[PDB]
């Protein structure tokens, strides 16, 4: 009901170049050049997480009668997708700490800044 339409198939292919242009701009030098981009990257990625997170709980609403259809033991793409969303959410709480004056950019927690 939510997956078989080509509208979500068209937006799933287009949301990655805005995802790349949102992660690959996490540099402190270009943070200092344009602070409005720093201010709008928060609401952009937050709206993107609001549209990304709804595909996981969507299985509950519509679950295939076929056994193993979405099983994590059989499909690796949903496992890797949950991995990217989990690292992306810990990146979101890192950015929440970054807006606050608790953690800076010169912290070792950026080793986790790799899997975007």
Pick from 57, 78, 65, 73: nearest CA to 2: 57
Contact (CB, 8 A) for 27 and 53? no
Contact (CB, 8 A) for 113 and 87? no
Pick from 93, 101, 5, 97: nearest CA to 49: 93
Resolution in A: 4.5
Query: CA–CA separation, 25 vs 41, rounded Å?
Result: 9
Method for structure elucidation: cryo-EM
Pick from 50, 47, 25, 26: nearest CA to 109: 26
- Taking CA atoms, 67 is separated from 2, 17, 60, 74, 80, in Å, by 20, 34, 14, 10, 20
């Amino acid at each position: 009901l939510w997956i078989n339409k080509p509208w979500v198939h068209s937006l799933l292919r287009i949301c990655a170049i805005i995802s790349v242009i949102s992660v690959c701009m996490n540099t402190p030098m270009t943070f200092e050049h344009y602070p409005p981009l720093q201010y709008v990257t928060f609401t952009l990625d937050t709206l993107l997480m609001f549209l990304y997170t709804a595909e996981m709980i969507a299985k509950m609403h519509i679950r295939g009668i076929v056994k193993g259809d979405s099983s994590y033991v059989k499909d690796r793409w949903c496992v890797f997708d949950g991995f990217m969303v989990f690292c992306l959410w810990v990146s979101l709480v890192l950015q929440v700490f970054e807006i606050a004056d608790i953690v800076d950019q010169m912290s070792p927690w950026g080793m986790l800044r790799i899997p975007r």
